[PDB]
Design an enzyme around this catalytic site. Sequence first.
Site, mmCIF file in Angstrom:
data_model
loop_
_atom_site.group_PDB
_atom_site.id
_atom_site.type_symbol
_atom_site.label_atom_id
_atom_site.label_comp_id
_atom_site.label_asym_id
_atom_site.label_seq_id
_atom_site.Cartn_x
_atom_site.Cartn_y
_atom_site.Cartn_z
ATOM 1 N N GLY A 224 37.550 36.220 36.702
ATOM 2 C CA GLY A 224 38.237 35.315 35.802
ATOM 3 C C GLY A 224 37.178 34.474 35.101
ATOM 4 C CE1 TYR B 141 31.460 33.425 40.481
ATOM 5 C CE2 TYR B 141 32.385 34.042 38.345
ATOM 6 C CZ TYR B 141 32.558 33.673 39.663
ATOM 7 O OH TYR B 141 33.830 33.554 40.163
ATOM 8 C CG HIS C 294 32.021 29.501 39.810
ATOM 9 N ND1 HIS C 294 32.664 30.330 38.917
ATOM 10 C CD2 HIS C 294 32.898 28.510 40.101
ATOM 11 C CE1 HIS C 294 33.877 29.861 38.677
ATOM 12 N NE2 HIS C 294 34.043 28.758 39.383
HETATM 13 C C1 FAD Z 1 44.448 34.600 44.479
HETATM 14 C C2 FAD Z 1 43.449 34.719 43.355
HETATM 15 C C3 FAD Z 1 42.149 34.237 43.531
HETATM 16 C C4 FAD Z 1 41.168 34.337 42.485
HETATM 17 N N1 FAD Z 1 39.902 33.860 42.745
HETATM 18 C C5 FAD Z 1 38.948 33.964 41.758
HETATM 19 C C6 FAD Z 1 37.574 33.576 42.036
HETATM 20 O O1 FAD Z 1 37.212 33.157 43.117
HETATM 21 N N2 FAD Z 1 36.644 33.700 40.993
HETATM 22 C C7 FAD Z 1 37.013 34.198 39.698
HETATM 23 O O2 FAD Z 1 36.132 34.246 38.873
HETATM 24 N N3 FAD Z 1 38.253 34.641 39.455
HETATM 25 C C8 FAD Z 1 39.234 34.558 40.424
HETATM 26 N N4 FAD Z 1 40.485 35.026 40.180
HETATM 27 C C9 FAD Z 1 40.823 35.645 38.864
HETATM 28 C C10 FAD Z 1 40.736 37.206 38.949
HETATM 29 O O3 FAD Z 1 39.382 37.573 39.295
HETATM 30 C C11 FAD Z 1 41.155 37.780 37.584
HETATM 31 O O4 FAD Z 1 42.505 37.353 37.341
HETATM 32 C C12 FAD Z 1 41.140 39.320 37.609
HETATM 33 O O5 FAD Z 1 39.816 39.797 37.851
HETATM 34 C C13 FAD Z 1 41.621 39.827 36.282
HETATM 35 O O6 FAD Z 1 41.679 41.380 36.378
HETATM 36 P P1 FAD Z 1 43.027 42.092 36.182
HETATM 37 O O7 FAD Z 1 42.807 43.585 36.364
HETATM 38 O O8 FAD Z 1 44.063 41.483 36.899
HETATM 39 O O9 FAD Z 1 43.423 41.900 34.822
HETATM 40 P P2 FAD Z 1 44.741 41.486 34.011
HETATM 41 O O10 FAD Z 1 45.013 40.033 34.013
HETATM 42 O O11 FAD Z 1 45.795 42.329 34.153
HETATM 43 O O12 FAD Z 1 44.286 41.611 32.633
HETATM 44 C C14 FAD Z 1 43.838 42.835 32.038
HETATM 45 C C15 FAD Z 1 43.579 42.499 30.542
HETATM 46 O O13 FAD Z 1 43.153 43.804 29.944
HETATM 47 C C16 FAD Z 1 44.301 44.335 29.190
HETATM 48 N N5 FAD Z 1 44.367 45.758 29.581
HETATM 49 C C17 FAD Z 1 45.074 46.313 30.632
HETATM 50 N N6 FAD Z 1 44.949 47.637 30.709
HETATM 51 C C18 FAD Z 1 44.124 47.976 29.662
HETATM 52 C C19 FAD Z 1 43.592 49.298 29.177
HETATM 53 N N7 FAD Z 1 43.865 50.460 29.730
HETATM 54 N N8 FAD Z 1 42.763 49.221 28.058
HETATM 55 C C20 FAD Z 1 42.456 48.017 27.446
HETATM 56 N N9 FAD Z 1 42.894 46.776 27.810
HETATM 57 C C21 FAD Z 1 43.728 46.803 28.926
HETATM 58 C C22 FAD Z 1 45.499 43.479 29.563
HETATM 59 O O14 FAD Z 1 46.535 43.502 28.606
HETATM 60 C C23 FAD Z 1 44.846 42.089 29.735
HETATM 61 O O15 FAD Z 1 44.550 41.374 28.573
HETATM 62 C C24 FAD Z 1 41.549 34.950 41.217
HETATM 63 C C25 FAD Z 1 42.881 35.448 41.034
HETATM 64 C C26 FAD Z 1 43.838 35.347 42.080
HETATM 65 C C27 FAD Z 1 45.223 35.899 41.831
#
Ligand code: FAD
EC number: 1.6.5.2
Lengths: 273, 273
Positions: A149, A155, A161
Amino acid sequence: VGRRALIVLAHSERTSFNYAMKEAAAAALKKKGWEVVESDLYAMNFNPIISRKDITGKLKDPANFQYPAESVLAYKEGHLSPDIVAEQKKLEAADLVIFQFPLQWFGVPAILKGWFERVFIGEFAYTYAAMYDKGPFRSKKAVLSITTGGSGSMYSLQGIHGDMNVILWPIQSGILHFCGFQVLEPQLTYSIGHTPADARIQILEGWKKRLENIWDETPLYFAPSSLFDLNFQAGFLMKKEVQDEEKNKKFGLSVGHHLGKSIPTDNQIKARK
Amino acid sequence: VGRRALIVLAHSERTSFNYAMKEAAAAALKKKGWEVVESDLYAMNFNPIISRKDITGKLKDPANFQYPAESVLAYKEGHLSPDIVAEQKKLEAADLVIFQFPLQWFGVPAILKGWFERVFIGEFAYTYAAMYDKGPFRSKKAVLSITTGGSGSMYSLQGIHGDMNVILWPIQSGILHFCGFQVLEPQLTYSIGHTPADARIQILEGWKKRLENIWDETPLYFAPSSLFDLNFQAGFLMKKEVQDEEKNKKFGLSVGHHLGKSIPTDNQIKARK
Ligand SMILES: Cc1cc2nc3c(=O)[nH]c(=O)nc-3n(C[C@H](O)[C@H](O)[C@H](O)COP(=O)(O)OP(=O)(O)OC[C@H]3O[C@@H](n4cnc5c(N)ncnc54)[C@H](O)[C@@H]3O)c2cc1C
Ligand SMILES: Cc1cc2nc3c(=O)[nH]c(=O)nc-3n(C[C@H](O)[C@H](O)[C@H](O)COP(=O)(O)OP(=O)(O)OC[C@H]3O[C@@H](n4cnc5c(N)ncnc54)[C@H](O)[C@@H]3O)c2cc1C
């Protein structure tokens, strides 16, 4: 070379970028002739909680249950829960193992952490008799593909961080290398939620491109076990000779083995050291 | 000071030393007039897997579910699962939080990692606006009481597993301090499996004695958020003035903020700003 790959995914949504990265990897690999198997933990409704139920047979000491020993015994006698055994069979067959997951609370998602705890059982995955580079998976290669995120600057050495290399260490050295894996450079995709649609597209293509020659890459650098006194009455400490030869060196060896000195740049992110 | 304490335990066996440690803490704290509450995860039949099942209302967007945004909305509109609400109520009341657990694969047990993921919801436990120093739990104190299979020397600067301070960083800085918690020195009891019946009893007594003045302890040192430009624009990097003034110091500020220099000795194990 290696013709077999296993991709372990830890994300519940098929609409996530993480799921897209998993599909991208499987497509690129199959195209280059690899046999690709997957472990979509959420899709499999995987059980990440360690318990006495991980042992099918009767226990050795049921009134004083110790997971480490009872599980090792179950591995040797052939009675680990069958869901565990199915994962262990996939691991044994794979040359390359890819872990695709979003960074959660500076670590691996709980469901993936539980997969390690239940699947990487003593003897099968590790032995105190053959630690790290001499471990059971020494002929295998592992890579972490992480989405974040936070932005890359957050980082960096001067980001709030802190250094991402310190965050990666417990996982790559403590889990992966400890079992013998040669750990390849991690695929890091920062602030994926703030990345333009076109950049997201190139991110997927750059991952597929990298996977074309993944097996020939030089792995990350970890201090060799030949430098340590691999025995209990010695405390598994670095050998005397080795300790001295190092006192005159400017840098430490790794993030974990910094020896109180400077940690070489991107020890856990870039290979070359 | 603080009259309310919450002990979160992550171990399946009532016969374990970890359970013993929790009981010791409870007894010791009550004796000194503390109000003690417990979260025995295994005994609470706790679910550690985050999913859309953590939200009871309608999702703002079920097409593409994104946990961070949806769980934050749920916290605000009061749509979180009843188990998360109850744990959040326990945390909100507590002055001190003790996390009792065995080290598992260089980290916290899957069940406890899951507890953080489902309980430490945005807005409740953190805000990117008021990270670390200014987090919601800034008026609370936290402590990790950990047991390990490996000996202390294995976790020293020359040990084969490497520096324990590096292993503790992701948890104490990335999870606890990020939410505002002042983190006290961790209680580390090494090689609990090779410790005589006589020695373990003193460990319990030693832990109990420490808890008698636990609240007036000097917390671990983490770089203050005042040293960073806290905005996406600045990338959340250290202030220019700080960077320069820091260039003349031998040691970095902490494990995560080592700045390519030497890591201050026992930054995550011993207090001393
Ligand atoms: C409990 C929890 C703890 C967390 N702790 C941390 C932490 O310690 N440090 C930190 O940095 N982050 C943290 N996060 C955030 C987390 O790392 C990010 O939310 C996550 O990595 C986002 O990846 P995702 O696959 O969910 O993406 P998504 O949110 O689903 O997003 C994907 C994005 O790419 C698009 N997309 C999807 N499929 C495709 C495709 N085929 N081609 C092109 N575009 C596409 C989507 O529409 C969207 O815009 C935390 C989240 C949670 C829920
Ligand atoms: C999946 C997994 C991963 C692991 N990864 C790691 C790792 O990365 N690094 C590492 O170092 N270790 C690791 N370990 C080992 C683990 O840290 C130890 O097994 C654990 O910390 C031992 O704590 P315990 O509470 O279970 O104690 P137990 O094994 O139960 O032992 C407690 C001992 O104290 C006795 N006892 C119980 N109650 C009392 C009492 N009230 N008073 C006095 N004595 C008492 C017991 O009879 C016993 O002899 C791992 C273990 C597992 C299962």
